Each structure stands twice: as structure tokens, then as C-alpha cells.
């Protein structure tokens, strides 16, 4: 009984050392740099082939192909420049809350209530997209799949366990068990050895690939965290919560830097992305619009209002050309 | 429609 | 419960940390934001000839 | 036109055509969410129909194609994956009447099921009551009083009166009476008519505001 | 992937014949089919092109309206129906997979080719030379020139490169003037400009002996160079 | 002495209100989406029929009022053909829209097969063609007729031969049976069966507000059937009375006759107001 008291005491010591080593008062620091100004994204292309609600999209590293996941049981690889459907992929489970697209462009991963992250081979002989590896071993719904490599996929799930996998064998290289609530998001680092995760227990945990243990755990949100994403430097990330706030967490400082909230916004965040320079933070709400956020000012500076339902998925290209947001409006739209 | 139909008046 | 003191070692491992002031981390954020402002198609709109959209 | 090996566009239109065909074929069907809680007779009803995570069961009745989303395998938070299931025609719902003690970890099959039935996305929750006794529920309500789980009950302890009180409590769970209709059915044997009952409930669902773009509802 | 085709033989001039091509191993419903012919002493030249599921059909202007193409998509069988064959149709005919989307590699897989003998404004491709003498290990460059520049507004220079081994089928080496095909070694490369094209094979080895062919895909018809044959 | 004022005022008001009603129906349905539902394309082509009826209303009015100058022999021919054609068109779209609602309600299993937009546009094109049967027949027997001062010339429909008013007896019985007797019977049986089925629906039966929704649906059922009967009844029965059965010719009957015509056109003028403004796809 007393050891639990000592553990709570060390938790209090950790949070007191978090507060004590910080005297920045970041509201003073933030105002120094110039504002970015009203950034009028305009819907350049509208991608009209989904007959149902869509939950995830992922971009390519060539910044021209984007995969799109939808509840009618379809993945679409979507030539973004010309609005051509390359590779409509028929799923086995129509309940897919996540989607991934390999940096090599050879593979797509998606999963959901089927508790399986299926891996699909895009570039193959015999023509059509085949399913390569069904990754079984989770028991909850799969909320996020992300490729580290053509043979390393990191998945997070609603059984409170993130797992890293070897696609060739099909078994978990690592499991990441430190979350108590259902895990709702992931983000791979730019250097691809760290990855951060967000869960329903309002705690965001950094992880390692080889170590397999949570180095750090970030709190501050009061509800589920629905979407998480690294800053492109890799030394920070931002979380999207049902709290109706977005928080910018730095790995190395170990405190929340800025909160992205306004008084008018009430609904929950659903997807988060960053610009290539990292000056502007995408954020996609249930208010039917992607209010896009200056990362440094913590000020809204533009609205990607084009959707007739809640916007579920957001993605910025790797070169920074585009932002493609899909929604239960059933249409993905690249703004620019 | 009205009956035109060689109507006598 | 024994799993509580098994979790004490994990939070003790998390406890060992290299803490950095928020000002320096925010300066790293600010310095990275200015450096890639040139290669940012959204911070400044690219000329429409170079734009593929 | 600047289209040279842009038979990519022809392939994209062909994919659009196949998508429209599959989407129309999918929206022609009926989606039911089997939301009955644990230790009920959801297994019993799915064996009564013709028939690792979500378990989707499809069946045919009177030229109408059904799909049943038995989601009992998920132990996650129900808040996160239930908004996926909006737009279902009806929610099948099992309740085990007996529990042999609710005829609160013991008397689960009344108060926990009562606690389950809360509503945030609105549709006709076709609640099926399942005795789990053939006719034996008579002798097990003779043996133990039903006032154990329901303190305010003072009606007759026979079959029909107690069953009607349980039904009345389950409808009193509902808040918005005019929006949703809770189609209630108590049957354990069910040689037929549980197929007919879900058929009639989803028929009244697809009539109302699903085939009332015309006819103005 | 295995494209086996039949229909070759000797036919009287003015007679009719239907070539067939039995695709066996791929999503033949999802592939554009071509046809390319080759006279026994001459180079390749295009014949026809049916799109994925007959959405778009072209023909060669030398045989426009006299040849008919037809795909049996559920049967997975490609036909070419020919009527009243002339003396210019002593040639051997190849089935050609192609598939078009962003990143795709058309003209990659070629059939075994069937031999057919009869009894008895657009782009032009210019070869560099008839032949180059060969020694293994020594780098050599093979060039073609075109009438019109091939670099479209896409940035996509529609230059292809091939190799028909002595007594074998062709294959694809460099598609769209820069990009390497799959199943071929990485020694090959392609450097091109507006109409100025070079195949920069380095570390020449055995089994690279044969005749190279260059093709344009900017517009129809598809025209082939004579190319070079690397032999001492 | 005010019958020119009465007839002209009635005709002008029903003309302008019908034409603007159909035109706003068109613009609002292009603002909305039409091709997603069978219902929107049905109300659209029905409003098209109503508008193309209402365009020919001055040409109907001049024969009573000015009496003397048919502006064109080809013009009166084409306005006659388009008038009879589009009257059949609007009536048949009303009938098929009632059958659409009856398939939607009484047979909801088969309605997912029948009520797709492709089958809807097929049936729409087919009934426009079967109306065009009347258009080509009126073109074959249409035009103004000139006669030497025994009557002033007028725009009408001509004889097949020296025998007439017996072929026109066939014309009158055909327009009566195939524009009133068949459509009124079909629309009453379809909406009555629709209400008899919709009484048993548990989303309509109990819970007084849902009974009020049943009341509103049967209310606009009676409004549709009542307006159609009240409009197309007096002119059809009036025309069948003036089959020269017993001294059916009188000079004062013409004002009432053209008022009956005005009611028949008032149906087409109110079909946008009756359908678009009052149906529950007003959420737009």
C-alpha cells in the first residue's frame, strides 16, 4: 500500500520537476516572429468517387499519389495531379479506420474493426493489387497503420497496444504496452526510429523501435486524443483531441508548448498534419472545416471550408505542394 | 387544353 | 498488486530524462520554421507555372 | 487535347463505373447492428436466422438481402467505433429475460442491459427479448420473485404481467418517443416470426424517410 | 505472366486470317493490348492497340480499316482479325502488354511472337547505325533521333527502348526515356533531350548481344527505329 | 359586359403565376441536385410540361378576345401541337408520379429495384415519347383554317376528310378516357392504397404527433386528387356536353367555357406550387 503512495509521490516529483525546470512563459516568446498571414487555400481538385464515409488518407513521397480509405470497402490510389483513379482496391472488411501508403510506393496498409492490418502489393506482376500480408495478433480495432519500411509496419489498436511488425514473417517484432485507454493515433519520426502515439486515456507516449519501451508520456488533454503527428524536425509533435484543443508537445522539453484552441470551436479534432516548413499546422474538425493553424502564433489564419460533413483525414505532401482532406462528405479535395 | 377542334361560336 | 511495483520500474525508466527549457525547444521550432520557408509551397504560393495544381 | 498515353483517363473512368456499380449494389442492402450485450442469446438468434473482430452475418428473407454486424468481439470503448455504424436501418438488440436471479454482478441481464440502452445516433432499435427458457420461465418466476431486480414492482408474478413490466421499463429507457420506434418481441423458441419481426421492423424503416423522398415524410 | 499466341502460317495473298493471343497469368481485363509486327529482314513496326476492355481502339495507317482487333475479356484471349493480306504482311507478330497510370511501365511484357508469311505527318524514328562491334566489359552508347521533340508538357519524354535477342522475344529496357524496367539489370540507362536520345549501357556483357529498338509513344502510329545490333 | 376583363384577367394571372412557378422550380432544382433521386427528375419534367403548357396561353386567349388575326399558319399549328402534347405530358407525369409513390410505399421491397434513377429516366423518356405520339398526330392534322366570311378565321385542328365531328368524336372520347378516366382512377387507387398501407406503419400509427404526420400525408393526398379533379373536371364534362346532344349551342356559354379552360390550365400552373412548395424536400 505504501509503495503505491511512493509511486504517486514519484509521479508528483516528475510533474513538479516538469514545472520547475520551465520558466519560459512561452506567451512572451511566441510574439517575436512575424505572422504568416491569411493563407487562402483553394480547392484545386475534387476527388469524387467515394460512395460512403471516408476515414483515412495517406500521401506518397512522390507527392502525386494519395491512398484513400472509406467505409464502403474501397482503397483508391488517386493520381492527384489529374484526378485519375489509379488502383481502386476492394477491401475484405468495410470497417477501416486507418490507411497507410509505403514510402517506396509499393505497398498500402489499412485496417479497422476486423483487427487486421492487411498489406496490399501495388507494384506487382499479374496486374491487379494483391493482398500480401494480413497482420493478425491485435484484438481491438486498428486505429493507425504506418510504414517504417517495405518490411516494417507500425500499427496501433483499440486493445490499448501499439505493435511493430515484420511483414515478411507476419508476427509482431515488438508490442508496445503502456496505454490504458484505446489507442487512436500514431506518427513515425522523420528519422524513423522514434514514434509517438495517442490514446483514449488522454496520454501521449513516445516510443522506440529497437528498445520497445515508452521513453516519455505526455498528458494535458482532458479527453481522447484522436490524431497525432510529428513536427517535420522530428523534435516535436502535435495532438488532436476530442477536448476541442490541439496541443504542441516537444519531445526534448517534455511539456506542452502551445495549445491551439479558440472560444468558438467546440467539436473534437479528427486529423492533424504539418506543413513542410512547419510554420502552419493543419487541423481537421467536426465543424465541417479544416481550420488551419499557425504553429508558432497559435492563431488561426485560414479555413479549408469545403465539406458537408465532418472532415476525417488530412495529409500534406512531402514537398509541401498540397493538402488533401477527406470527409464523410465522401469527397477528398486537394487544397493548395 | 380547350377544345379548338373546329369549335363553332 | 505486484503489477503496480512492476510498473514502478517503467515509470522510473521514464523518469530518467534530459530536461531542456521550453525557451530553447521553442527556439529550435522557430529556427526550423524560418529555414524551410523558402521550400514551403503553402507559406508562399508558388508561381502558377511551377504549380502542378 | 493533351492526352497521349492518357488511357489513364479511360482506366479512371472504368474504375468510376465499377465503383458506382458496387456502391449501388451495396446501398441496395440492409445493414443491421446486433448490439446485444454479453450472456444474451445473440448466438441463438443468429442460429435462428438462415445465416475475429466484427462478425458480419448475411442472410436473405423475402427477396431482401441483410447483413448483421455482430460486434460483440470488440472490448474497446463503444464511443469510438459506433459512429461507423450510423445509417443502419435497425439495431437488433438481445436481452436475456431470465438470468435465473433477475427473474449487481449477479442479476446482470436486467440492469446492465438497461444501462446499455442509451442513444446518440437515432434509428429504430428493434429490441428482441429472449427468455432463454422454453416455457420453464413460468416455473422459474414461480420459484423466485421478480421484485429482487425491480423494487417498485407490485404486479402479478405470472408470465405475461412480469414480461409486460420488463417491456414497459425498456421502453421507458427511450427518451425521444416520436423519432425512434422500439419494436419489442419476446420469444425463445422462434420456429419463425423473429425473422418476420425484423423483416417488418426494417420494412417500416425503409418505408419511412428511406422511400419517402417521394410521398413527403 | 505468360502470353501465348497462335495463328501463324502460310496464307494466300488476298486471303484472310485471324491471329489469337491467349493471355495466361495476369489481370488481362485491366491491361491495354497492342500488336507489333516485324518483317524477317526489317525492324519492328506497330499494328494496333485495343484499350482496357475495348474503350479505345487504334490501327496502323498502313492497314487501317483492313485489320480488325477484338479482345475476349472474360475468356482472357486477344484476337487480331486480318482480311485480304498483301505482300507487306510477311512479318512476325507480337502481343504487347501495356498499362497506363502514373508511374506505370507500358510495353514491358511481350509475347513469344508468331510468324506469318503470305505466298507468292507522323513521327519517324532514325537509327544511328546498322551495327556496332562488341567486346564484353566496354561501355557503348546507342542513339536514336526523332522528327519531333518527344518531351511533352508533362515532362514525360515518351521514348522507349527494347532488345530482341537472336531467336527470342523482345523486352523493355528504358521506358519513358529515363526509367528502368523490372527484371533487367541496373547497368542500362537512358539520357535524352528534345529528339536527341542515347542508350547509355555500361559494363557490356554477354546475352546483351542482339538488336536494340527505340520507340515513341507520343502519338499514333507508334514508330520504331532500325536501332543497332551489337555484334563484332 | 365585363367578360373580356374577367377572362383576360384570369388568363393573365394564371399565365404569369404558372410561368414563374415553373421557372423558379427549374432554377431551384439546378441549385439543388436532381439526378440523385427519381423524385427530383419527376418533378422537374412535370414542371417542364407545365411550363410548356403555360407558354401557349396567350394564343389560347386571342381566339376568344381578338378573334380576327391568327399571327401565323405555322405558328398556330405548332402552338396547337405543343399544347395538346404537353397537356398529355403533364397529366401522364402526374399519373406516373403517383405510381412512383405507390411503389415506394406499398411495395418497399421491390422499390429498391424499381425506384433507381436510371429506370426513372427511362420511364420519363418513354412517357415523353408516348406524349410525342399526340404531338406528331397534331402536326399531321394541324394549322389554322381560312374561310370566306361565314366565320372569322381561327386556329384549330382540321378534318381528315369531308366527314368530321365523328372522327373528332373519337378524338374527344380518346382525350377523355386517356386524360381523365385512366389518370383519375389510377391516382385515386394508388393514393388510397398508399394511405391504407401507411395506416399500419408503426412510425405513423400511435403517438399523436406521428398520427398528425399521417394526417398531413393523407391531407396532401386529398389535395392532389382534389386539385386534379376540380381542374380537369369542368372542361372535360363541358366538352362532352357540347357533343350537340340537345341544343348545346349558346352564345353566353363561351365565357364559362373559357373559364373552364382557365381552370384546366390552372392545374398546370399550380403543380409547381402544389408539389415543390409543399413537399418535404423543402429542406433546400
Tab-separated table of N, CA, C and O in Angstrom, chain D residues 109-154:
chain	number	residue	atom	x	y	z
D	109	UNK	N	-28.736	-9.385	-16.239
D	109	UNK	CA	-29.445	-9.347	-17.507
D	109	UNK	C	-30.610	-8.365	-17.543
D	109	UNK	O	-31.231	-8.220	-18.595
D	110	UNK	N	-30.858	-7.622	-16.468
D	110	UNK	CA	-31.832	-6.537	-16.486
D	110	UNK	C	-31.176	-5.172	-16.338
D	110	UNK	O	-31.354	-4.313	-17.203
D	111	UNK	N	-30.387	-4.959	-15.285
D	111	UNK	CA	-29.943	-3.598	-15.003
D	111	UNK	C	-28.766	-3.201	-15.880
D	111	UNK	O	-28.619	-2.026	-16.240
D	112	UNK	N	-27.931	-4.167	-16.260
D	112	UNK	CA	-26.829	-3.849	-17.161
D	112	UNK	C	-27.347	-3.587	-18.566
D	112	UNK	O	-26.910	-2.642	-19.233
D	113	UNK	N	-28.295	-4.407	-19.025
D	113	UNK	CA	-28.912	-4.183	-20.325
D	113	UNK	C	-29.694	-2.878	-20.341
D	113	UNK	O	-29.735	-2.184	-21.363
D	114	UNK	N	-30.330	-2.536	-19.218
D	114	UNK	CA	-30.970	-1.236	-19.088
D	114	UNK	C	-29.941	-0.120	-19.183
D	114	UNK	O	-30.215	0.942	-19.750
D	115	UNK	N	-28.747	-0.343	-18.632
D	115	UNK	CA	-27.719	0.689	-18.678
D	115	UNK	C	-27.109	0.802	-20.069
D	115	UNK	O	-26.620	1.872	-20.451
D	116	UNK	N	-27.115	-0.294	-20.835
D	116	UNK	CA	-26.582	-0.270	-22.197
D	116	UNK	C	-27.416	0.630	-23.100
D	116	UNK	O	-26.868	1.440	-23.859
D	117	UNK	N	-28.742	0.546	-23.000
D	117	UNK	CA	-29.642	1.208	-23.939
D	117	UNK	C	-29.639	2.712	-23.681
D	117	UNK	O	-30.516	3.270	-23.022
D	118	UNK	N	-28.612	3.374	-24.212
D	118	UNK	CA	-28.583	4.824	-24.346
D	118	UNK	C	-28.330	5.170	-25.810
D	118	UNK	O	-27.696	4.398	-26.539
D	119	UNK	N	-28.836	6.325	-26.242
D	119	UNK	CA	-28.989	6.634	-27.658
D	119	UNK	C	-28.317	7.957	-28.008
D	119	UNK	O	-28.534	8.965	-27.327
D	120	UNK	N	-27.500	7.947	-29.069
D	120	UNK	CA	-26.844	9.153	-29.572
D	120	UNK	C	-26.954	9.304	-31.093
D	120	UNK	O	-26.871	10.420	-31.615
D	121	UNK	N	-27.111	8.194	-31.814
D	121	UNK	CA	-27.396	8.196	-33.246
D	121	UNK	C	-28.709	7.450	-33.460
D	121	UNK	O	-28.820	6.273	-33.101
D	122	UNK	N	-29.691	8.124	-34.061
D	122	UNK	CA	-31.095	7.746	-33.913
D	122	UNK	C	-31.553	6.805	-35.023
D	122	UNK	O	-31.450	7.137	-36.208
D	123	UNK	N	-32.098	5.655	-34.630
D	123	UNK	CA	-32.706	4.696	-35.544
D	123	UNK	C	-33.611	3.771	-34.743
D	123	UNK	O	-33.611	3.791	-33.511
D	124	UNK	N	-34.374	2.949	-35.456
D	124	UNK	CA	-35.372	2.094	-34.820
D	124	UNK	C	-34.694	0.871	-34.219
D	124	UNK	O	-34.389	-0.089	-34.930
D	125	UNK	N	-34.497	0.887	-32.900
D	125	UNK	CA	-33.751	-0.156	-32.202
D	125	UNK	C	-34.667	-1.344	-31.950
D	125	UNK	O	-35.354	-1.395	-30.930
D	126	UNK	N	-34.648	-2.318	-32.855
D	126	UNK	CA	-35.573	-3.451	-32.813
D	126	UNK	C	-35.184	-4.422	-31.696
D	126	UNK	O	-34.619	-5.493	-31.924
D	127	UNK	N	-35.546	-4.045	-30.464
D	127	UNK	CA	-35.145	-4.808	-29.282
D	127	UNK	C	-35.910	-6.120	-29.200
D	127	UNK	O	-37.135	-6.139	-29.064
D	128	UNK	N	-35.184	-7.229	-29.264
D	128	UNK	CA	-35.757	-8.560	-29.127
D	128	UNK	C	-35.496	-9.034	-27.704
D	128	UNK	O	-34.356	-8.985	-27.230
D	129	UNK	N	-36.552	-9.476	-27.021
D	129	UNK	CA	-36.448	-10.088	-25.702
D	129	UNK	C	-36.337	-11.591	-25.897
D	129	UNK	O	-37.090	-12.181	-26.677
D	130	UNK	N	-35.389	-12.203	-25.205
D	130	UNK	CA	-35.145	-13.635	-25.307
D	130	UNK	C	-35.245	-14.233	-23.909
D	130	UNK	O	-34.521	-13.822	-23.000
D	131	UNK	N	-36.170	-15.180	-23.736
D	131	UNK	CA	-36.408	-15.761	-22.418
D	131	UNK	C	-35.189	-16.524	-21.923
D	131	UNK	O	-34.803	-16.400	-20.757
D	132	UNK	N	-34.584	-17.320	-22.805
D	132	UNK	CA	-33.653	-18.422	-22.590
D	132	UNK	C	-34.319	-19.590	-21.865
D	132	UNK	O	-33.620	-20.514	-21.444
D	133	UNK	N	-35.645	-19.585	-21.705
D	133	UNK	CA	-36.409	-20.723	-21.212
D	133	UNK	C	-37.530	-20.998	-22.202
D	133	UNK	O	-38.154	-20.059	-22.705
D	134	UNK	N	-37.785	-22.279	-22.477
D	134	UNK	CA	-38.773	-22.669	-23.478
D	134	UNK	C	-40.170	-22.303	-22.999
D	134	UNK	O	-40.840	-21.452	-23.590
D	135	UNK	N	-40.610	-22.959	-21.927
D	135	UNK	CA	-41.755	-22.484	-21.160
D	135	UNK	C	-41.407	-22.459	-19.681
D	135	UNK	O	-42.238	-22.106	-18.837
D	136	UNK	N	-40.163	-22.825	-19.363
D	136	UNK	CA	-39.704	-23.016	-17.993
D	136	UNK	C	-39.670	-21.712	-17.206
D	136	UNK	O	-39.594	-21.739	-15.970
D	137	UNK	N	-39.720	-20.576	-17.906
D	137	UNK	CA	-39.709	-19.269	-17.258
D	137	UNK	C	-40.907	-19.094	-16.337
D	137	UNK	O	-40.827	-18.371	-15.340
D	138	UNK	N	-42.010	-19.787	-16.633
D	138	UNK	CA	-43.141	-19.837	-15.711
D	138	UNK	C	-42.734	-20.409	-14.359
D	138	UNK	O	-42.989	-19.798	-13.318
D	139	UNK	N	-42.087	-21.574	-14.350
D	139	UNK	CA	-41.753	-22.190	-13.070
D	139	UNK	C	-40.614	-21.441	-12.374
D	139	UNK	O	-40.550	-21.410	-11.139
D	140	UNK	N	-39.717	-20.812	-13.142
D	140	UNK	CA	-38.654	-20.016	-12.511
D	140	UNK	C	-39.123	-18.629	-12.081
D	140	UNK	O	-38.406	-17.929	-11.360
D	141	UNK	N	-40.304	-18.193	-12.516
D	141	UNK	CA	-40.841	-16.991	-11.889
D	141	UNK	C	-41.786	-17.381	-10.753
D	141	UNK	O	-42.050	-16.588	-9.842
D	142	UNK	N	-42.273	-18.626	-10.762
D	142	UNK	CA	-42.925	-19.161	-9.569
D	142	UNK	C	-41.928	-19.328	-8.428
D	142	UNK	O	-42.259	-19.081	-7.263
D	143	UNK	N	-40.704	-19.761	-8.745
D	143	UNK	CA	-39.734	-20.089	-7.701
D	143	UNK	C	-39.170	-18.840	-7.027
D	143	UNK	O	-39.082	-18.780	-5.795
D	144	UNK	N	-38.785	-17.834	-7.810
D	144	UNK	CA	-38.182	-16.642	-7.236
D	144	UNK	C	-38.955	-15.397	-7.648
D	144	UNK	O	-39.369	-15.280	-8.806
D	145	UNK	N	-39.163	-14.457	-6.731
D	145	UNK	CA	-39.865	-13.224	-7.090
D	145	UNK	C	-39.004	-12.329	-7.964
D	145	UNK	O	-37.774	-12.340	-7.889
D	146	UNK	N	-39.672	-11.547	-8.803
D	146	UNK	CA	-39.004	-10.603	-9.687
D	146	UNK	C	-38.824	-9.239	-9.035
D	146	UNK	O	-38.204	-8.351	-9.626
D	147	UNK	N	-39.264	-9.086	-7.785
D	147	UNK	CA	-39.068	-7.824	-7.079
D	147	UNK	C	-37.616	-7.617	-6.665
D	147	UNK	O	-37.267	-6.544	-6.160
D	148	UNK	N	-36.766	-8.632	-6.857
D	148	UNK	CA	-35.359	-8.536	-6.473
D	148	UNK	C	-34.644	-7.481	-7.307
D	148	UNK	O	-33.964	-6.596	-6.775
D	149	UNK	N	-34.786	-7.560	-8.631
D	149	UNK	CA	-34.147	-6.578	-9.501
D	149	UNK	C	-34.991	-5.316	-9.622
D	149	UNK	O	-34.454	-4.221	-9.832
D	150	UNK	N	-36.303	-5.444	-9.480
D	150	UNK	CA	-37.223	-4.315	-9.599
D	150	UNK	C	-37.938	-4.084	-8.278
D	150	UNK	O	-38.970	-4.731	-8.018
D	151	UNK	N	-37.430	-3.194	-7.417
D	151	UNK	CA	-38.101	-2.947	-6.127
D	151	UNK	C	-39.519	-2.416	-6.251
D	151	UNK	O	-40.379	-2.764	-5.431
D	152	UNK	N	-39.798	-1.599	-7.269
D	152	UNK	CA	-41.094	-0.934	-7.340
D	152	UNK	C	-42.168	-1.838	-7.927
D	152	UNK	O	-43.340	-1.448	-7.984
D	153	UNK	N	-41.798	-3.038	-8.366
D	153	UNK	CA	-42.774	-3.945	-8.950
D	153	UNK	C	-43.715	-4.501	-7.891
D	153	UNK	O	-43.277	-5.035	-6.867
D	154	UNK	N	-45.017	-4.375	-8.150
D	154	UNK	CA	-46.029	-4.961	-7.283
D	154	UNK	C	-47.162	-5.595	-8.078
D	154	UNK	O	-48.244	-5.810	-7.518
